[model samples]
Target: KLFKNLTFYLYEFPNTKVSRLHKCLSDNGGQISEFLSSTIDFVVIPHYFPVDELPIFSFPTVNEWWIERCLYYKKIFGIDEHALAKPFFRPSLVPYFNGLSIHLTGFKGEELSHLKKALTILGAVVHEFLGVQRSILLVNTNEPFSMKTRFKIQHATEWNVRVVGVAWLWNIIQSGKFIDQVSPWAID
Candidate 1:
């Protein structure tokens, strides 16, 4: 019952039945709210809703998998890791990163190609160089320290862009949303 004190609003998700989804939220300690309001803590939805189209709701909207992951993780960890977890749910095929640009460095061969394709599919404009316009610099810290990595990090620092690792991308893929948490693979 970690979510017992939190209020939630559920929106009908596409595909799969929502009856089970509703029951899961209710059974797992969420106090389903009547509508989106200041008192609400979370909005349960299947995909990302356009910000301009949505009302001025302040709460985070999560995917249905979030509830499932919470239950799954709780059973293994014996603690509620999903309690008030930030929004990490996104629709499959929707453009989540419509305007942002991402640059990859320090990753070679197959890893580089895979990430580029994946990031592109996720809607981010991937690039080969670190520039002012790039918002993210995904670096592979697993490899030996290289001059390119250092320069990318320095440039990213100067540009105030995010410098993360391959794991960060994996985290996004696993959660289906962009999380703000710092990745262990982050290079400063």
Candidate 2:
């Protein structure tokens, strides 16, 4: 029921057929369109797909990985993280986080939720508390550290977790690659 009311256009490549992808989308309550038009909400294309063969599409295009992960996790992921074959779009970003356990301190409201979503799309599992399983603690660079944040830093050090500032996340998202977690510039 996740893709209910959604329409997808799965691109058919000369070298590869997307029958399985088409069926998966159709079976999961999404409508599959044989045509690429404004009626289609998403255009699923293959990664490393030939660039010259693409037609000018006003609609959004994403990699096949988006569909696979959406079905694998049974959730609709943000398209920006899985976007492909477009100018200014980021793709082939599978190995950046790969399920890192990240705990953020000093983020709240909209920024908090958006940051969590960014981390999720980058393949990191977020947590509210610092523990042995927590791989990194991201401290906000702008917000002044409070007593509670100080405690988190202390606990992270004791647990042997990488303690870094939120700029790490910023730099990662900006550069489309992971930055050093313990850099002198990135450390809080």
Candidate 3:
């Protein structure tokens, strides 16, 4: 309903799709504009891909997931202003980290890259160590157990810090809040 009151412009970069996106926005009661101008309230992208430069347009640039999640949740979610014009990994939901400090371990490859990107886009400070005050430890559930991970968990526990699994991160993104439930991925 809020979108009906606002006009949108959908921008696509190379190797990206933007045609179907216009239809989705229209069907959702959003007015689509053919030209980029000052009146556009938001510019939607298919993904967090890099633009040649961060445009100084008067509208907020956001990912498609932000709109999809807004439809799913039946509420308007604000875009991460810090993510604007950056090829950053943005969560589907609103940024909820609120500048939380997080330490990651036992993650590698594409998963690690994506997780770190999401955390940064969500406004968390990623650290290499767990005990740097006001931080939580995120452990990869599928990672092979090693003494390094064990020691990290030991130190985190000793410091009364929370040690959570990757699923905890996803839970926050999906729920749009820091969930208080025990990490379902945690093993006894």
Candidate 4:
């Protein structure tokens, strides 16, 4: 798959049950998307309803235009464009903010790596667009470690970005440059 540009979509699913992680993602998503759009080639469209409902999204002209115009376009709209544009045509509130949160729960080997990769994805999104770090955290169960050591190891990972450990995240949060909104998963 060769291409002039590439973008990763951050789809939002409000129909699904909202979790603490979901809320965090919603907050983080906005911050990250905003940063990416501004710094590099990206766009952030918030879908209050659903992606499918959006009329502009449905119009072939608009669709083709956006696709052809933007060297790289990232689709974060969760619901299809068709469902998102309904509100403009009709009037009704869904009542539920029903946002999403992204939590890193139990994942054994490669999946565990994905959790870490998500953090880097977030970092790249935040850094590329926002030009800084978005205050967020990933609570991990382990002893403390220095940023130098942590960054060294995290960078070695396939993601290529450093997954700053919990302690480092705290330091970032304390700096007021980033915020930690991660929830600790509990075993029932």
Candidate 5:
């Protein structure tokens, strides 16, 4: 299928806000991770993690491979260890766009309004790059997320919207987006 061949475009910001919101924002199962996992062909992280003199942890997909990397990044960036202790995941899929995105969560009320303002500007930025109306932006900041595993899983399974919708995935995959060959994975 074309979808299997086409790469997803994942975007993200490197510096997160703080521990108060890091868990839901930076964790492997958090919004950023979920977004990256669901969308993008490959992740483009701002930093890399090194272990035993070898880089081991990194965030490019929706998996917990950036724990070590985050630590290393914190050290280099002069952030406190406690401040750096957050999970990081890479995109389960890949991103194709030339720029990364800022995943805004952990905000509310006036703060939420501020985020909306920032996103409006972000849209302008994307417009400058991909044309005013050509760029696509998806927002998930206001939706109440499940703090419990059961709720999270249940919500994830129910009323979940696939990144490009099921039909788009089918169309792209059938059109041979991956290696000019049909996708072996089931779209539905």
Candidate 6:
């Protein structure tokens, strides 16, 4: 009954394998509609709205990540995307971190693999060593450490490489290079 009494319109998602989305909606009692309407409750898309010049829908629009959160938290996290006062879309950001090389420490298992994949998508080179080739070293602030951590920090400082917490990774991902994102998350 998580999405009970709500209706969803799944459309305008280009090149995304969104087959499981309405299926997830189906499991949660979300009524799926096949056509556009002013009366529908919500519209789901991968990113921006469908309209090139106008998005005159009466209901709200949200990102697919919003759906994932609702299912994970067992409740709504409110809408993630909405009609702006004007039509606004972020330009593609894949090249923002291009040629940036990074090394990661203190992240483990699933999270580590996940971060590596994300960085790779951003055109960054994720490396195993904290040597000169890597410009940044990202670490987990909350984790217990070994000299593997200690020596990495030492070498990074020696090479003038920026050492920042994993939060910086998230910040750059979210805001897409607003800050150096390096200065703020340093451990000490």
lDDT of 3 by residue, 18-135 (tens): 5567667778788888688877888876455434344655667776666765676577866752232224443433345765788888986544655676677667888866674746
lDDT by residue for model 6 (121-144), tens: 556799977788687888878688
RMSD of 2: 8.1
Q: What lDDT does candidate 1 reach at residue 39?
A: 79
Instruction: Give me candidate 2's TM-score against the actual structure.
Output: 0.52
Least accurate 10 contiguous residues by lDDT in model 4: 89-98
lDDT for model 4, please: 0.30
Clashes of each: 0, 0, 0, 28, 31, 0
Question: How many Å off is the CA of 33 in candidate 1?
Answer: 50
Estimate the TM-score for candidate 4.
0.18
Global lDDT of model 2: 0.69
Candidate 1 lDDT tens digits, 62-120: 64545655565463221123321323324443455677688988877544654575566
Query: How close is every model to the real structure, measured as TM-score?
Result: 0.47, 0.52, 0.49, 0.18, 0.19, 0.59
Give the better candidate number (4 or 5) by TM-score.
5
Q: What is the lDDT of residue 71 in candidate 4?
A: 23
Over the stretch 98-141, how does candidate 2's per-residue lDDT look in tens digits?
76899999876545765676566656789977787788888987
Candidate 4 per-residue C-alpha lDDT over 117-147 given as tens digits, one digit per residue, 9 for 90 to 100? 3334233222221111322223343534455
What residue runs in model 6 are displaced by over 4 Å at the alpha carbon?
14-16, 47-58, 80-92, 103-120, 125-133, 139-160, 165-177
**Candidate 6 clashes between residue pairs 3 or more apart in a chain or in different chains:** none
Error of 1 at 93 (Å): 6.7
Q: Compare the candidates by lDDT and give the number of the best one.
A: 2
Model 5 lDDT tens row, 97-118: 2243322223345434433433
Best by TM-score: 6
Q: Which scores greater on TM-score, model 1 or model 3?
A: 3
